[PDB]
Amino acid sequence: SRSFIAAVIAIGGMQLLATMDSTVAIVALPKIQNELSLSDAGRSWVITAYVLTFGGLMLLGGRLGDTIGRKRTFIVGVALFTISSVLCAVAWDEATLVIARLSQGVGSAIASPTGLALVATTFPKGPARNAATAVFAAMTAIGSVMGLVVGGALTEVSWRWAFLVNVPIGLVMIYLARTALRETNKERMKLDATGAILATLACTAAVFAFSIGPEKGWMSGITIGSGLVALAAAVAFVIVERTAENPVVPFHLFRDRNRLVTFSAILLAGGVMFSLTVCIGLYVQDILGYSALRAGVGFIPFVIAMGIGLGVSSQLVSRFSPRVLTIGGGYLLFGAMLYGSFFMHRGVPYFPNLVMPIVVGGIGIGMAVVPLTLSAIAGVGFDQIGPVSAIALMLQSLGGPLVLAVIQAVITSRTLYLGGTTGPVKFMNDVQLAALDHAYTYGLLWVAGAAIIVGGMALFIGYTPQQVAHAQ
């Protein structure tokens, strides 16, 4: 009872912390610019510092779990995250802020992968694993909405006070991490230093190239050089992993078609969800003119609906195949994305027009999330959960930017076609506002079209409700 609650909260705390930090950091960018006197490059670098280390230290963090221990790695990561958040709060110049953000991203990349391995190992297959997966999914949304609310609330005094909010809750997690999580005293495995180094180099180079491409121009020497470095590092990693004991990423796993389909669905679904949340935030905080507080408190129905959906999916996964639940959730998600696409324009009441799509989509996402997570880590084995979980988190965090960039490009092209301007929102006339509203409602259609493929690829799962939701 109490032990299970403590264990699931300790496992899910890292996702809550990371999402809260990201949301609060993105909310209070321009007060930071005013106080620190930063340029556009500094504004980009503040967010880029997190992503560089988050992406460049994913597989390594997944592998160190067997090298040292999962519990020790979890507390180490949470402690580093808290210390680097304190450094972010105390940071006085641009260099200190960048260093602190890089350290916090290092802690996130060393702590997040181990959470999925912990949820796989601590609880065996059965109802306990289902409930743990539901809690793990719910913590992310709860953290996102809470971070949005607190960041909006703390916009009146200073941006420094916002980072310190990450200190107490994290400490609580540490306390829980010291009690519920146990150690099996299993034999300690080794690490493939060459493969891990190659993977880290390739990931860091790719992330740096992707971030610096649009900002400094494409094919600007640095961009192509970083791309070539990433390609060479990936090729060397693939060559090395062919005959290396305890691979960083086992390629022979990806032969099964069930797992390939599941992972591709994970990538696409993560991209769609990230694009949806970014677009809805921009539309609510830009077009309708809602403040940060109202935008934050308007997503509580989303949290409640997603929790209800996750609970229902956890209850019903023990008898129904994962593809059925995935398509069932997608049905309501696609209904909401169309209702919003057709009957949303500036000047509509919140209650009868905006909250119902939120509730329907949240319920659909609640049913959709659990079966994919259960299928990803199904029948994997202890000595191999690490890389699978690391790849799952990597794909979820990687699908986002590409789809978001495509949607923003479509919206910009539509706005240019309607007769608007690409300037700032705060210096816009009525015609440009109408053009932007129509462009956003048009981009929702492309998001739904992407969801079409996301769901159609999920018809080839093949898993049965006896390999993911029963004991042994």
Ligand X SMILES: CC(C)=C[C@H]1[C@H](C(=O)Nc2ccc(-c3ncccn3)c(Br)n2)C1(C)C
Residue 148 and residue 299 in contact, taking contact as beta carbons nearer than 8 Å: yes
Residue 312 binding partner per list a second copy, ligand X, none, with a CB distance cut-off of 5 to 8 Å that depends on partner kind: none
Residues 6+ apart with CB under 8 A from 349: none
Q: Which stretch binds ligand X (CB under 6 A): 199-207, 278-286, 362-370, 375-383?
A: 362-370
Axis crossing angle, helix 300-316 with helix 355-376, rounded to the nearest 10? 40
**Site string (413-452) toward ligand X, x via CB under 6 A:** --------------------------------------xx
Residue 273 binding partner per list a second copy, ligand X, none, with a CB distance cut-off of 5 to 8 Å that depends on partner kind: ligand X
Q: Is 365 in the site for ligand X (CB under 6 A)?
A: yes
User: How many other C-beta atoms can be found within 10 angstroms of the C-beta atom of residue 293?
Assistant: 14
Q: Is 455 in the site for ligand X (CB under 6 A)?
A: yes
Residue 451 binding partner per list a second copy, ligand X, none, with a CB distance cut-off of 5 to 8 Å that depends on partner kind: ligand X
Name the minimum Å distance from CB 451 to a second copy.
Answer: 12
Which one, 297 or 327, has the nearer CB to ligand X? 327
Residue 335 binding partner per list a second copy, ligand X, none, with a CB distance cut-off of 5 to 8 Å that depends on partner kind: a second copy
Name the minimum Å distance from CB 367 to a second copy.
Answer: 14
Which one, 200 or 397, has the nearer CB to ligand X? 397
Please tell me the total number of residues recorded for the chain in this structure.
Answer: 472
| CA atoms 458, 460, 462, 465: torsion sign | positive
How many whole angstroms separate alpha carbon 417 and alpha carbon 411? Answer: 10
Which one, 320 or 331, has the nearer CB to ligand X? 331
Instruction: List residues binding a second copy (CB under 8 A).
Output: 323-324, 327, 331, 334-335, 338, 342, 445, 449, 452, 456, 459
Axis crossing angle, helix 40-56 with helix 29-36, rounded to the nearest 10? 120
Name the minimum Å distance from CB 445 to ligand X.
Answer: 8
Residue 307 binding partner per list a second copy, ligand X, none, with a CB distance cut-off of 5 to 8 Å that depends on partner kind: none
How many whole angstroms separate alpha carbon 375 and alpha carbon 368? Answer: 12
Query: Cα torsion at 444, 447, 453, 455 (round to 10°)?
Result: -80
| Residue 373: closest CA among 146, 131, 144 | 131
Residue 326 binding partner per list ligand X, a second copy, none, with a CB distance cut-off of 5 to 8 Å that depends on partner kind: ligand X
How many whole angstroms separate alpha carbon 459 and alpha carbon 463? Answer: 11
Residue 369 binding partner per list ligand X, a second copy, none, with a CB distance cut-off of 5 to 8 Å that depends on partner kind: ligand X
> What angle is formed at CA 330 by the lines to CA 326 and CA 331, rounded to 5 degrees?
120
**Site string (256-275) toward ligand X, x via CB under 6 A:** -------------x--xx--
Which one, 154 or 279, has the nearer CB to ligand X? 279
Axis crossing angle, helix 355-376 with helix 127-153, rounded to the nearest 10? 140
Residue 342 binding partner per list a second copy, ligand X, none, with a CB distance cut-off of 5 to 8 Å that depends on partner kind: a second copy
Site for ligand X in 316-335 (CB under 6 A): 326-327, 329-331, 333-334
Residue 13 and residue 136 in contact, taking contact as beta carbons nearer than 8 Å: no
Name the minimum Å distance from CB 186 to a second copy.
Answer: 41
Structure tokens at 379: 């029948």
Axis crossing angle, helix 166-177 with helix 70-90, rounded to the nearest 10? 160
Question: Which residues sit at the interface with ligand X, rule CB under 6 A?
Answer: 269, 272-273, 326-327, 329-331, 333-334, 365, 368-369, 372, 451-452, 454-456, 458-459
